[PDB]
Structures are given as structure tokens and as C-alpha cells.
């Protein structure tokens, strides 16, 4: 079946019912610092092309909720990188996209409100939003090094081809 995260740890913290997983990033946010060789963002990107075809997905750990969020976001990125005419430009719009206020668990627009726990209060709200933005910025940054061929001004058709597919038939823009 679908690919699940193996990063869940007996000491992994939570923000809502999502896993606040560590990430190797320079962007600001509540994400713990990641020492290990790979993080939830790498995992998400490594499973993307495969997971995106699935329509059903069993939520096993709170880590899966984070993995799912990122998977949905990668799609958002592809929708944008698709029209970029150079790697640098794609990095520009990847920052912009990371900046936009996408809906969060509990709000109208968020595609999986029945699965994700809504922030219990204003602090949790701000932290969660902050963790999501940090995840978006880091994800979008790393995706650019994958989507563009050594010959920039050319987003790989091998990534662009997935632009029309939706993980679990869901969408962060829908």
C-alpha cells in the first residue's frame, strides 16, 4: 500500500495531532533541529511520486499526518514550478508560495478536517501555523534542486507530469 513515515519516535512531540518532526533548515519555526541524515521532508519527497497515486491512506502515526501535509504541499509547488523559466525563478516563487497563508486543520479549505485535530488555542494556533510555514519553505527549497535539470529554464517534465494528480484526491488549494 502507501508509504508511511518511519520517523515517529517515543519522544516525538506533537502540535495538535500532527508530529512536530525535526528538519534540517535555516528557515525560522518551531521545528526541532535535525542531526540525522534525513528528515520528514526528505522522506516526503522520496515517497512523493509513489504516494501521489494512492487514493486511500491509513493514518498510523501522527508522523503520517505531517508526511501527508507535505505530500499535499509538494503538489502545490509543482503547480507553480510548472511555469517557471529558470531554477532561480522557481526558488523565488517557492519562497512566495511558502509565505502564502494556506488553510490549517480546522479551517474551511483545509482538505482533511476529520483527520487532523484543530489547534486547541491561540498559542497552538500560532505555533502550528509557524511549523507549517517552516515546512513549506524548506520543502519548496529542496524541491527546486530536484525539479530543474542542470540545464535550467527547464522544469523537468518528469516532475511536471504529476501536476494534475492529487494525493487522496485532496488539495491544499481545494
Amino acid at each position: 500500500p502507501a508509504y508511511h513515515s518511519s520517523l515517529m519516535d517515543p519522544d516525538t512531540k506533537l502540535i495538535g495531532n500532527m508530529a512536530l518532526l525535526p528538519i534540517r533548515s535555516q528557515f525560522k519555526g518551531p521545528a526541532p533541529r535535525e542531526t540525522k541524515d534525513t528528515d520528514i521532508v526528505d522522506e516526503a519527497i522520496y515517497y512523493f511520486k509513489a504516494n501521489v497515486f494512492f487514493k486511500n491512506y491509513e493514518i498510523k502515526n501522527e508522523a503520517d499526518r505531517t508526511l501527508i501535509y507535505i505530500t499535499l504541499y509538494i503538489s502545490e509547488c509543482l503547480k507553480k514550478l510548472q511555469k517557471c523559466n529558470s531554477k532561480s525563478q522557481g526558488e523565488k516563487e517557492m519562497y512566495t508560495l511558502g509565505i502564502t497563508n494556506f488553510p490549517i486543520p480546522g479551517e474551511p479549505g483545509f482538505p482533511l478536517n476529520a483527520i487532523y485535530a484543530k489547534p486547541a488555542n491561540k498559542q497552538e494556533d500560532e505555533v502550528m501555523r509557524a511549523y507549517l510555514q517552516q515546512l513549506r519553505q524548506e520543502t519548496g527549497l529542496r524541491l527546486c534542486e530536484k525539479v530543474f535539470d542542470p540545464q535550467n529554464d527547464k522544469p523537468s517534465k518528469w516532475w511536471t507530469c504529476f501536476v494534475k494528480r492529487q494525493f487522496m484526491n485532496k488539495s491544499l488549494s481545494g
Binding site: 508509504y3 494512492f54 507530469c161 504529476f162
Partner: protein, 393 residues
């Protein structure tokens, strides 16, 4: 007899025909007939390749869903199978025809009526497809001990079935149909191409997809790992397909990629292309076998035989056996923990006579002295009636 019997295996998308004794069918033609829609207008028709894109004619598929939709059309189809392709004097040859799973006694009489009343054949035997497939597998190097107890996995062009058989007799109430077959895989590959490759002639979209499916596809062991191999060393995985444009006569090339393994993958993850079916084929097989009598359960798991063009994908059998073993092993494990069932031997059989298993099996059977004994004759027909062709000895 001096002349070999005629063997006809009419399939949803392809009809295999030839004479008994031969290892391969003499003709494999599309199961279609082209008609115009008094006098001899009934004879103005074509079948097979010649019937696919006939300008002034309309192509029909009398069996594209498993059963005969039009007996008039089927009857005519046979006229040409006999007098145009096989070139057999029907009165001098016994005929062996095959039937779809759970064919009714009524339909058998309709077929006998055509063969005896229209063509006056001297002998007719309507064979059950699954039994012939099992017999065909006896040719396999994985099987040197012949047995008619096994689980047949027949995947053709429009239909796929998991048929359990016990000592030559199909366990009809345990059969399961799977909404994935050749056409589904082709359509899917076509979509994957629509999202990536440019230049594919609209008129030749399915055609191109079919070729990719038949010439480049295979079954991989893991999706992420395969997608990775491709992204890591595209040079050794992406292929090229240079087709021919008809209404342009110009050349057109495309890269063939992920579709190679994604196509057959839908057997294992139907949800990829089917919104209403999600059961993996390994799970369907396990399910079928678990519904059968306990005493025949192991013999079934140990003899899972493949049949049909859609089972031709490389490593289909291996992938099916592994995933099925996981399911079985996982269960027996969870039962010994929750609580000592001896290990379950699961074996998927792939053999060379797999593309035309049914026809081959039917060919071997109609070329043995025995065949002429179990075959209902024209005599018994005219005296006892058509009802005789219900039981298939």
C-alpha cells in the same frame, strides 16, 4: 482420424484458432466483426484485423464483456473462422470450443445449435477455460507432476478471473472477478502518456499505449525504489518509441518512462486507475482460496496458474507470489501470537505456453485418442437432443 480437430478459443478481445496437435494457434485475430448498418447482405462482413477500421462498415464486439452479446454476429463470425481462415470442411472435423466461467446450459445449447444445425459438425466439445489452462501449465518446468487442482488466474483483454478448480471441477460459487484487465492497463498507460509526452497522434493514442504496454512494461518489486532508479540513472531506464503518423505520414518519437512499471502495477493497486475497486490481486486470490473447502485450500495455494495475455508482464508471477506469501505468513503469524498452523506453501506457476494457455490446453486435449470419446456427436444430438452438450466429460 486422418484430419486434426479444429480448436477455437473465442476471447473478449482475441479469438485463437487452429488445428489440434499444434503448439501455437494458427491465427490470433481480434474478436470483432464489421457489418453494414435481403439477398446476401448477411455475408457482407469481415472479422479480425480486416474488420477493425473498415470505412463503410461498423465494427462490433460480440464478446467484449465475457459472454455472447449477439448470437447472429457470433454465428457469422464462425462462418469465416471455418471457411475463410481454417479452411476446414466443417462436416469432417470435430470441434473444440471454449466457454467463459459459469456459462449456462442454455448458452451451450445455442452454440451446439449453431455448430450442429448450421455447420453440421460431426462432433463438438465445449471446454471450460480454466481446466485447459491448468493442463497447459503441465508443460512448465516448475511442474512435472500433473494435477487438475489449482487456482487459475486468467487475465485477458476485458476480463480477469480467479478460478479455483478441484480435481477438474470448477468451484463455481467461489469464483471472483477482478475489474482490471488489458484494456484497463492500456487506458491507464495512455493517461500517463497524455500528461507527459507530446506529439502522440490523437488517433493513435491507445495504439501507442498498447505497444508500450506490450513491448516495454514489467512488474517491479517496489514503487519508490523504482521511481528512484529512474530518477537516479534515467539513462538506463527511460526508453524511446518512434511511431508512425498516418494522417501526416510524419515521424513521431516519445520517451517511455514510469508507465513501464506503473501500468501492470494497477493489478496490485487498482485504486491507481479504478475509483470503485481497491483490492490488490494477491488479496483477491487469498480471499477466493479462503472461501473454498479447507481440505483443498493448500493444494490451491500450491498451484496458482497463470493464463492470458495480461499475465505476460515480466515478474507478474513473482510479484503475485511474494505479496500473497506475505499475507498468508502474516496471518498464520498473527494467529499463533493471538493464541501452530504448519507453513503455507504458495506457488505461482509461469510457463511458456501462457499467452495462449487455454488454446494450447484445448489443442493437446483434442489431439488425444480420449477426446473422441468424451465429445458429443451429431448422432446423439439429433436423437437425444441438444441438452447432451451440458455435461462436459
Amino acid at each position: 482420424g486422418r484430419l486434426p480437430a479444429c480448436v477455437v478459443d473465442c476471447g473478449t478481445g482475441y479469438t485463437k484458432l487452429g488445428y489440434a496437435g499444434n503448439t501455437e494457434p494458427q491465427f490470433i485475430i481480434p474478436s470483432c466483426i464489421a457489418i453494414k448498418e435481403k439477398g446476401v447482405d448477411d455475408l457482407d462482413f469481415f472479422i479480425g484485423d480486416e474488420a477493425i477500421e473498415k470505412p463503410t462498415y461498423a465494427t462490433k464486439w460480440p464478446i467484449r464483456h465475457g459472454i455472447v452479446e449477439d448470437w447472429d454476429l457470433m454465428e457469422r463470425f464462425m462462418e469465416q473462422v471455418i471457411f475463410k481462415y481454417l479452411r476446414a470442411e466443417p462436416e469432417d472435423h470435430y470441434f473444440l470450443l471454449t466457454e467463459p466461467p459459469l456459462n449456462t446450459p442454455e448458452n451451450r445449447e445455442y452454440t451446439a445449435e449453431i455448430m450442429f444445425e448450421s455447420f453440421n459438425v460431426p462432433g463438438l466439445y465445449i471446454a471450460v477455460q480454466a481446466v485447459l489452462a491448468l493442463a497447459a501449465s503441465w508443460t512448465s518446468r516448475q511442474v512435472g507432476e500433473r494435477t487438475l487442482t489449482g487456482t487459475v488466474i486468467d487475465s485477458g483483454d476485458g476480463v480477469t478471473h480467479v478460478i479455483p478448480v478441484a480435481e477438474g471441477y470448477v468451484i463455481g460459487s467461489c469464483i471472483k472477478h477482478i475489474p482490471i484487465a488489458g484494456r484497463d492497463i492500456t487506458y491507464f498507460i495512455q493517461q500517463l502518456l497524455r500528461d507527459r509526452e507530446v506529439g502522440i497522434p490523437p488517433e493513435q493514442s491507445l495504439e501507442t499505449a498498447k505497444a508500450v504496454k506490450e513491448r516495454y512494461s514489467y512488474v517491479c518489486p517496489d514503487l519508490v525504489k523504482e521511481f528512484n532508479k529512474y530518477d537516479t540513472d534515467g539513462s538506463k531506464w527511460i526508453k524511446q518509441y518512434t511511431g508512425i503518423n498516418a494522417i501526416s505520414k510524419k515521424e513521431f518519437s516519445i520517451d517511455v518512462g514510469y508507465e513501464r512499471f506503473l501500468g501492470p502495477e494497477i493489478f496490485f493497486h487498482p485504486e491507481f486507475a479504478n475509483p470503485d475497486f481497491t483490492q490488490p490481486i494477491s488479496e483477491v486470490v487469498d480471499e477466493v482460496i479462503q472461501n473454498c473447502p479447507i481440505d483443498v485450500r493448500r493444494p490451491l495455494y500450491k498451484n496458482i496458474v497463470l493464463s492470458g495475455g495480461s499475465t505476460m508482464f515480466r515478474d507478474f508471477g513473482r510479484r503475485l507470489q511474494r505479496d500473497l506469501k506475505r499475507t498468508v505468513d502474516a496471518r498464520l503469524k498473527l494467529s499463533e501470537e493471538l493464541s501452530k498452523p504448519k507453513p503455507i506453501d504458495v506457488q505461482v506457476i509461469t510457463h511458456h505456453m501462457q499467452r495462449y494457455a487455454v488454446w494450447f490446453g484445448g489443442s493437446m486435449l483434442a489431439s488425444t485418442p480420449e477426446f473422441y470419446q468424451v465429445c458429443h456427436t451429431k448422432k446423439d444430438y439429433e436423437e437425444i437432443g441438444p441438452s447432451i452438450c451440458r455435461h462436459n466429460p
